[PDB]
Structures are given as structure tokens and as C-alpha cells.
Design a protein around this ligand. Structure first.
Ligand SMILES: C[C@H](CS)C(=O)N1CCC[C@H]1C(=O)O
Ligand code: NA
Ligand code: NA
Ligand SMILES: [Zn+2]
Ligand SMILES: [Zn+2]
Length: 259
């Protein structure tokens, strides 16, 4: 399950579909009036994501917005091509917009340098904390969840099966990780942001979480169980809470390391 690998797309719940690679989540949120894609995966992933969207019976021209969680290569590397293939506008937290436009991280990014750059992307605009993105019957809410990056966004919406509507959360990474030459200890406002974000995430309404790294909420296990139990298997409203706590533990572990 490498970040750029192939992966048979599947429905997670209702009009929420997985269209990413084997190691990184991307989600298509489909409607008759156009689709929203969350994240583009790697630069070569763009090949894969675009195949899937079509493998599920959808056109790329119907993709109107690409939402970014955050601007590291493994989630955002493919965004540029998908923009080109779809013609979509790319949406991102203000602080990551330049990194998507240019391909190159700011010095303030903990993985400046350690993550080599990626292809800069056309048609990028910022979203604000709380902003509601509408596309026909679709409504996706941005939540600022900075820390791992300054412009990190967690995205939420609702999908319905047989009249049962669930709150779906595409959770940004909340992990304190960086280049070797970077210390969270010397960046206490970065630390406060991470802490703010744990809180925000563990408070979201969260029936179904899809983590940017899909194993962070057991995607492939859930998918296995879903062959049996249907898409119930993806539903677990403790999931965002779980994610936040692993992030918060990971910040303890990391600040320790540093001393
Ligand atoms: C470094 C990445 C974010 S870009 C991350 O959070 N990963 C990478 C693999 C698992 C997961 C984690 O540490 O929880
Ligand atoms: Na973002
Ligand atoms: Na929806
Ligand atoms: Zn990252
Ligand atoms: Zn990542």
C-alpha cells in the first residue's frame, strides 16, 4: 500500500466514495449537479484517482472542486493534474494556498526540506474556518485544523443511505512530525494549534471518519468487514475522538523525544 499505488474505488456511504490510492485517502462526493474531490494524492496518483472516478461511472468534467486537507506531497502532489483534467477550482486553508500554487512548502512547515516539493497547481483559492462550500445539493464545511501544517483543513458533510443520513468527516493529519532539523519545542504557537485542533476534531459530529492516512481509522479492515455487514462497517462515531487522542499522544511522545 504505497502512496501512489492502484486501488479499486468503492462506496463508503451513500454518495461518499473512495477514489484514492492504496495508501492515501481521496474521496469523491458525487451528485447529478457535479462532484467534489477531496485531496489529489501524489503526483502520479493523479493517474489513479482519475481512473477510479471514471471506474465508478463518473466524468472528470463533472468534478468542480478539489478540496485539500494539507499541502504535503503525498496528499497534494496529484492535485495539480486533477485540476488540469477536471478543470476544478482547488480549495485550501489560506496558509497552504501558496504551497499549492507553487508546489513548494514555506520554511514554517515542519517538513520543509524533508518533503521534496511537488507540482504547483492552477486555480487555487483559500477557504476560511467555518466556510460552507456548496455545489448543487452538496454542502461541505471547512474546519481549520492546523498544527501539522499551518493551513490544514478538516472537511465535513452528510451522506444518506435508505433515508439514514450520517455526518462524514475527512480528517486531516494531526501528527507532530517534521524534518530532522525541526523542533516543535521552539515553535509553541504551532504546538498550541495542534492542541486547538485535537479539541476541534474530538468535538465534531462524526459518524464516519475517513483519515487522510486511511489506516488511521482502519479503512482496509472496515472495508473487509463491509463485505459482510454493508456500509455500517465504516460507521463509528467514536472515530474522530480516537483520531484526536492518537494525535495528542503523538505530541507527548514527540516533545519527550526532543528534550
Ligand atoms: C507523516 C504522515 C502525514 S503527511 C502521517 O501522519 N503518517 C504517515 C504514516 C502514518 C501516519 C501517521 O504517522 O500516523
Ligand atoms: Na487545506
Ligand atoms: Na452529500
Ligand atoms: Zn502531512
Ligand atoms: Zn501524508
Amino acid at each position: 500500500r504505497d502512496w501512489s499505488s492502484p486501488q479499486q474505488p468503492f462506496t463508503i456511504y451513500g454518495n461518499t466514495h473512495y477514489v484514492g490510492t492504496g495508501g492515501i485517502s481521496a474521496v469523491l462526493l458525487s451528485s447529478p449537479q457535479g462532484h467534489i474531490l477531496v485531496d489529489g494524492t501524489t503526483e502520479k496518483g493523479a493517474q489513479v484517482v482519475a481512473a477510479n472516478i471514471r471506474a465508478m461511472g463518473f466524468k472528470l468534467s463533472d468534478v468542480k472542486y478539489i478540496l485539500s486537507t494539507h499541502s504535503h506531497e503525498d496528499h497534494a502532489g496529484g492535485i495539480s493534474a486533477m485540476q488540469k483534467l477536471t478543470g476544478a477550482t482547488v480549495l485550501a486553508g489560506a496558509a497552504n494556498v501558496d504551497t499549492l500554487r507553487t508546489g513548494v512548502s514555506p520554511k514554517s512547515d515542519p517538513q520543509f526540506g524533508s518533503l521534496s516539493n511537488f507540482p504547483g497547481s492552477a486555480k487555487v483559492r483559500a477557504v476560511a474556518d467555518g466556510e460552507l462550500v456548496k455545489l448543487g445539493p452538496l454542502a461541505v464545511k471547512a474546519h481549520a485544523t492546523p498544527g501539522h501544517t499551518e493551513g490544514g483543513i478538516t472537511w465535513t458533510w452528510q451522506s444518506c443511505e435508505q433515508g439514514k443520513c450520517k455526518d462524514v468527516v475527512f480528517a486531516d493529519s494531526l501528527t507532530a512530525v517534521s524534518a530532522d532539523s525541526y523542533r516543535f519545542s521552539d515553535h509553541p504557537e504551532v504546538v498550541a494549534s495542534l492542541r486547538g485542533s485535537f479539541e476541534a476534531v474530538e468535538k465534531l459530529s462524526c459518524d464516519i471518519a475517513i483519515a487522510a492516512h486511511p489506516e488511521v481509522n482502519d479503512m482496509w479492515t472496515r472495508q473487509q468487514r463491509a463485505a459482510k455487514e454493508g456500509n455500517s462497517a465504516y460507521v463509528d462515531n467514536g472515530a474522530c475522538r480516537a483520531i484526536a487522542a492518537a494525535g495528542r499522544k503523538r505530541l507527548e511522545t514527540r516533545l519527550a523525544s526532543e528534550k
